[PDB]
Amino acid sequence: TYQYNMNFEKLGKCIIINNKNFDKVTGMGVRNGTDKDAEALFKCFRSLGFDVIVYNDCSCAKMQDLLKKASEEDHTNAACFACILLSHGEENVIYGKDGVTPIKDLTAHFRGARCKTLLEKPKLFFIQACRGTEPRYKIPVEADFLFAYSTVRGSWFVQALCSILEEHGKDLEIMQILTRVNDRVARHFKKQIPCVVSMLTKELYFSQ
Amino acid sequence: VPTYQYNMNFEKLGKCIIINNKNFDKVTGMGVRNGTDKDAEALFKCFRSLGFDVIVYNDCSCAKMQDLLKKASEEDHTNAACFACILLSHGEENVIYGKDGVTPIKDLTAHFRGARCKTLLEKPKLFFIQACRGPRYKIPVEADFLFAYSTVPGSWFVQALCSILEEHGKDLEIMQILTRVNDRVARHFESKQIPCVVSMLTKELYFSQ
Numbered sequence: 001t002y003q004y005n006m007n008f009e010k011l012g013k014c015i016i017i018n019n020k021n022f023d024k025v026t027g028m029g030v031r032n033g034t035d036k037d038a039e040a041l042f043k044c045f046r047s048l049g050f051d052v053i054v055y056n057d058c059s060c061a062k063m064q065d066l067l068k069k070a071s072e073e074d075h076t077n078a079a080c081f082a083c084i085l086l087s088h089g090e091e092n093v094i095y096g097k098d099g100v101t102p103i104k105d106l107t108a109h110f111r112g113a114r115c116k117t118l119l120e121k122p123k124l125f126f127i128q129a130c131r132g133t134e135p136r137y138k139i140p141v142e143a144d145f146l147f148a149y150s151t152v153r154g155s156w157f158v159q160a161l162c163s164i165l166e167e168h169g170k171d172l173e174i175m176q177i178l179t180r181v182n183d184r185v186a187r188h189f190k191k192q193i194p195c196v197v198s199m200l201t202k203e204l205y206f207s208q
Numbered sequence: 209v210p211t212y213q214y215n216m217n218f219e220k221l222g223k224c225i226i227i228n229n230k231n232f233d234k235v236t237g238m239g240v241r242n243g244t245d246k247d248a249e250a251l252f253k254c255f256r257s258l259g260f261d262v263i264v265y266n267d268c269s270c271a272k273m274q275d276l277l278k279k280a281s282e283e284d285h286t287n288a289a290c291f292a293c294i295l296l297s298h299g300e301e302n303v304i305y306g307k308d309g310v311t312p313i314k315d316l317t318a319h320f321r322g323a324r325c326k327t328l329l330e331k332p333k334l335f336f337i338q339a340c341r342g343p344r345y346k347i348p349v350e351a352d353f354l355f356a357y358s359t360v361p362g363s364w365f366v367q368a369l370c371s372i373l374e375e376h377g378k379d380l381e382i383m384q385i386l387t388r389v390n391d392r393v394a395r396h397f398e399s400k401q402i403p404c405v406v407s408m409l410t411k412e413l414y415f416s417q
């Protein structure tokens with residue numbers, strides 16, 4: 001058909017990495033409001049039907065273990081998988097507590113072969129990366145991956161994602177939502193905008 | 209605003225620029241891209257049929273591709289709904305091959321920005337790239353842009369794009385079209401790559417009226 005088959009026991013797992021406080025050795029500031037963000041996101045995504053678990057002030061190897069363990073889990077009764085990252089981010093890279101980890105390394109574990117159970121099922125990656133002290137990136141290319149990447153109450157992106165999903169999460173296809181989100185943050189405005197990278201093969205709805 | 213789809217009530221759909229690079233200077237060390245004419249032709253027929261004003265350029269230098277698009281960006285687009293541009297060439301990272309060399313795909317698209325192309329503000333700017341290989345990039349982040357970058361070596365992507373676009377071009381939304389595209393090039397392989405769609409679009413895009 002033209003939609004991802006959503007007929008499974010559970011929707012799927014949803015990991016939230018919520019890096020707020022950073023090790024002195026990175027000169028990275030307190031991301032105030034990431035707590036308002038992560039709460040909003042937990043409530044919103046749990047409402048969709050995800051098995052949300054939040055992890056805070058994660059080290060780089062924590063972030064990598066979290067995700068490798070997740071990939072290693074049996075996902076036969078899951079309709080899909082979803083990771084959300086809140087942090088400082090530069091290019092191809094997220095900040096953990098104790099330094100920087102490359103984004104693509106977190107998703108690698110979920111590839112075609114490496115996660116046979118999650119094959120032909122959407123892997124959803126929501127990234128909200130901050131700048132700021134106080135050059136290139138490679139998006140990995142695999143079927144059934146989606147990224148919603150952003151740069152900046154909590155963040156305008158996070159706020160919008162929840163508001164729309166809370167409201168149309170059950171009746172709109174993933175792309176329509178993210179578009180409405182893209183639109184919403186644009187309205188606020190130098191000028192920045194989230195982007196959606198889609199390697200999806202079908203339409204994604206969070207119901208039926 | 210309040211509708212969730214781009215206003216398409218204009219005199220015309222807009223321009224569609226195809227750049228069809230088949231032959232390259234021996235110095236570049238790139239081969240003849242056999243089957244790219246079949247792509248150029250299918251695409252032009254396809255996008256013509258949608259209602260775009262198609263122009264087809266062939267075997268371009270880097271300076272041509274650069275000048276070409278700058279002059280396109282300097283036109284008056286007030287009576288158009290959108291703008292499409294299709295690049296068929298050799299391409300590595302953030303770079304597309306002209307016939308004599310290699311320009312950054314970014315500088316080509318730079319010209320169509322709100323800042324420097326005021327007549328295409330809040331109108332979708334569509335880049336379909338079919339870059340053959342023969343390593344990191346940097347995607348420009350501006351509202352109402354959309355990229356459809358395929359890497360897979362008529363081209364499987366190009367053929368699929370046209371076939372879906374001819375049959376559903378006036379009833380589906382681009383994200384639907386291109387999702388369906390991803391799916392077939394992906395199906396050509398339970399014997400792997402796949403095209404990726406980068407969207408900065410702010411509304412739904414229907415090519416109809």
Ligand SMILES: *SCCNC(=O)COc1ccc(Cl)cc1Cl
Pocket residue numbers: 091092093103104107137138139140147148149195196197347349406
């Ligand atoms: S969508 C264009 C914006 N992209 C970035 O700034 C960096 O994005 C990414 C980097 C690595 C990975 Cl695995 C995915 C993405 Cl979207």
Ligand SMILES: *SCCNC(=O)COc1ccc(Cl)cc1Cl
Pocket residue numbers: 139141197301302303313314317345346347348355356357359404405406
């Ligand atoms: S969609 C991620 C994979 N795309 C690529 O291989 C290269 O992507 C790009 C490079 C430059 C520009 Cl302007 C746009 C894109 Cl999508």
